[PDB]
């Protein structure tokens, strides 16, 4: 083990995310928007992917969906940009270990979920400029999907946010236990794998679906509304997986005692 | 050839790991249960998969599963956290290499099962909580799994629970005998691939598919006592696969005379 | 994290551009046309399976192809040769960060442009000369798909191109943030499944699917205003993806703010 | 190109597993029955998916058993466990080079011949013991596949022997001329690929498949006197492929003459 | 850095025509060894094709596509001689003035050879294991020699072009790069696209027509069909691999 490392380095990145927020919030904010704009690719691809299988009737669908989606938490940890859920771990243990305060927290968080949305919305608009989503399976996929994740009971949100930030957050923490790229990567596919065909919520990812969907004339059924209920109960949810379980344990595993 | 050092290694590790019990219970319980957590991240996203493709008739059913387990000891490895059935080789090793006494190595086997089994009540709970398994495939996947486990002959999960723990434990070996973390995971892939598509018994995957059958409402299957009796042969068999093949085997090839 | 650095090895990969341009057109031609030319041997072999699994009514086909592309940039970036797409980042980093001008960077572009249709010209030849599109799906494939990308409304093909070099500069981007080959294989891989399988439009590609349709004899039905009419709308888009987004976002990640030498952030 | 370097590596290689049999019978053994019982874990896992994809008449039956063999071989490099078939090219390139005699050789590779059957046996009745090939397509892969391999004429199987030690040996080759066991296990999987999916004869596979067809009590299609023929004949072809094709092959290209 | 890369090319090309002249045996046993793994990798593809067409999959030259990798890989890995990768380095080196044109014709010559004996015997070993007695691998291997002998000669020219720029191309990555991962998954990608796409390579059609001419399965093949499409598909790869790949290395190195 390297658990006292491990905490070492996230304090270290605790104090250097919010030193750069308070250097620049420019700099901080379009790093948060290319980290919402990257996640928000691998929803463009996955949703592409699943428009196709669904009109085949493919019970493969969700698996390789699923198997599809590492490119969006690979595009953050390569390019070194800004993503709130990873955040949820990374400042909490930080802030236990003293690195960081509560109000240091709070404003990262609050920034780079405001970021990532930025990204999101850029994607979306973009997207459904190139006419992709005027019509067809993919404009489909969106408009259900972002219907369903909309009209589901609090409890089930939040739950399905816990548990993908636990796989969101572990992943970013393999990503401070190993030099290998390619190994971070790997895991990096291998949580992703489990968070999509697992069917678990991810705020950030969320974004794009419902940024998509209603900047599409594809009418689909969401209203803002709607997107502003599964994003807050998603949220809640992320926070309480990468804080309360990943923050809080790989604080205990590593505190200096 | 380099046994030697493998044992040397193995003993190391088994010396570190009674030292962490004695220092800290907290932090022992606390990496025994994420690691049981990250064990039924895997069985979370295969049943799942299971689910899909059963309710299809799919013939790549298992095939499928065993390729998309990897996950499971992928992120224990990755994460450095503790594993029962790890363990079993570990201690074993180091007991017979003097590093460790025969009371150590009961007592970490017993905090490190108690831990894993925290981990898996703890992920079933929040699994139920996603409404995931109310109805519908997967659910039915899980009550079936469980079920069948549960009724079968104790020497048969005792034979199973064996060829499993000798495959989790020589991906422990190789992890103790390579630098390079991609091969590490390589390597445990495959052997969670031929585990999960062989047929082979893991009792703390096991923990996690009895503790979602049985918080379930939605599922009525299976029993504590069902769980107790498949945990407990399971458990033996991977005890003996892990120690007396694995533990005793590296100790043999290791032991300078 | 580590921005800085990152933004002095694009603004070094710039200046090593216009220089070896400077130095020698013939070494800057011919590595562009090898870009082209490799970027081509994807369209070549996507374009085969798109026929294959057309023909046969697969669902799978977009996937397939996307899970198939990577060779196009991983030649490229495993090469070391010029390709436009990427010089949009390249470039436009590097001059923001004044170690180019904008005089070398449209030249650069211009060159790179050029240089990359030349290899697809002479794939194209090569390709339709293996008798491979003389008839059959891919023969079709190849120009069905080059009359539908040619009669697209001019925004949709904007925003494709914006996408897709956001995708081909990202990739290239990692490629200049690690050490390891395989790592940059892999990103490259991710990146181009999703520029395939998403529907996004990349003009050095479309350079090798108009030469094989228009050097093809099984006839075309495309015509040539059409092959300019996209390029020129797929490369425009492609420029403000690589250069307004990656180039300038990376600019911006890692430019010391000490300087302030001309512009304060906030 | 490094020939030298090469034949100097499989000399060093050849004398170590000399003096490791003249210093301890039983740690060569041992050693020896891991790498069978790891060759025969890969055969367990693509014998399953035999059954599991020719019950459903699928046409990429032999295609994905090939693809999943990859374990046997990287189990055995990983682990630096003794290997039968390796030991024909090792120990013949180390004798034409001098470093150890032609009865050094005779006697590595009786004693490993052995030494792997000992694990495929122990493997075969643990396996039995599962009731995992008790009945169902399972077994009948194992009792069709004894019983083919057992009525192939002598000159089919020869040739077949010499193939698969080409290939396994051209594994073992590439393990010493990288440092990169990523790589190691690429080739091992290519190499084992082509050996599954072509249909070659690999003798301490072919001790698995017998093990389990004659422990079982469901499996009645082939005898001891069947398994016996098979094994010398491919045996003999395997000694031709590994011996005088990789072995003297080495030699010849790496003889500073 | 192209430069360093030329010169490693150079000192490549050096080697080989040293090597040569040291040894026939040496340099002859290395090219045969080099055939056979293409060959292995013929083998393998071959059996799939045969599976896959009898079953009238439409994935099937993707999945031989895929499949074929181990044929350069175990080429490079083992450090062994192949002609189709000698065009690239020998023009390389020569233009480089590294070796002389006669080395070169002679290391082509030598190269060529070698492969071929190489293919011979793996297809005389092959046969002999009775797997291609009958069945559709067995017709897969007549088929396939057949269509490769009966095709026009400037279709097979060309095909040999592409062919030997997408060898020679994983050849060079292998020089760019320390990682024999990332070389490996480069030959994958360059071999995926060879095969799928359609493209001929004569040292991989050696072991076809050796199997094919060495089979008990009757094909309209003939000794004239194999030396016609061996001789057509050469001159595609040689113009391949030393005009687009020897050439284009050379000027984007040359320190003028
Ligand atoms: C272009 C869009 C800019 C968005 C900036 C959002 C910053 C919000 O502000 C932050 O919010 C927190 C809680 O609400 C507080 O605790 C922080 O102190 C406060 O700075
Ligand atoms: C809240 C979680 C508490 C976990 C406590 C586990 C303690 C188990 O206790 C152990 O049991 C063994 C026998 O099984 C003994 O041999 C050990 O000596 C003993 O320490
Ligand atoms: C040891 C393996 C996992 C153990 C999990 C124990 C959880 C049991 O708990 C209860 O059991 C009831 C009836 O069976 C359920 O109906 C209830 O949902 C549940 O509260
Ligand atoms: C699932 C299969 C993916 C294979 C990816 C392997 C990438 C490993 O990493 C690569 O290979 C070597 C590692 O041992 C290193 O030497 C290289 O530097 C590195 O580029
Ligand atoms: C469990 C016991 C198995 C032991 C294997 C015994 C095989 C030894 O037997 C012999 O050894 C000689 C050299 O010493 C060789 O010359 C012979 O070839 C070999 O048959």
């Known amino acids: 083990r390297a658990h006292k490392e491990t905490l070492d380095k996230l304090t270290n990145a605790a104090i250097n995310k919010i030193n750069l927020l308070n250097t620049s919030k420019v700099k901080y904010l379009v790093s ?6 990257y996640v928000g690719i691998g929803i463009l691809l996955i949703f592409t992917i699943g428009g196709l299988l669904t009109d085949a009737g ?15 938490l690979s595009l953050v940890i390569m390019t070194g940009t800004e993503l709130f859920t ?30 990532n949305l930025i990204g999101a919305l850029v994607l979306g608009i973009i997207f459904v400029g190139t ?8 404009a489909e996929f969106f408009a259900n999907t972002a ?13 399905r946010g816990i548990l993908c930030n636990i796989l969101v957050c572990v992943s970013v923490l393999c990503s401070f236990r190993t030099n290998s790229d390619t190994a971070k990567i790997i895991m990096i596919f291998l949580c992703l794998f489990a968070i999509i065909t697992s069917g678990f919520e991810h705020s950030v990812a969320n974004m794009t679906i419902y940024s998509v969907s209603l900047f599409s004339p594809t009418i689909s059924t969401v209203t803002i509304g709607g997107a502003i209920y599964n ?27």
């Open 32 to 37: 948060s928007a290319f980290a919402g704009l």
């Open 58 to 72: 493919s019970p493969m669908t969700k698996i390789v969906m699923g198997l599809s989606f590492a490119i969006a």
């Open 86 to 115: 990873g955040n949820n771990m990374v400042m909490s243990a930080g802030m236990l270990n003293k690195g960081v305060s509560i109000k240091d927290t709070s404003k990262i968080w609050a920034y780079s979920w405001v970021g």
């Open 131 to 138: 006419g992709l989503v005027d019509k067809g399976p993919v």
């Open 147 to 159: 219907a369903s994740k909309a009209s589901m009971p609090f409890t089930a949100l939040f739950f």
């Open 231 to 257: 994003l807050v109960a998603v949220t809640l949810g992320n926070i309480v997986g990468g804080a309360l379980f990943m923050g809080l344990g790989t604080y205990i595993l590593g505190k200096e005692k």
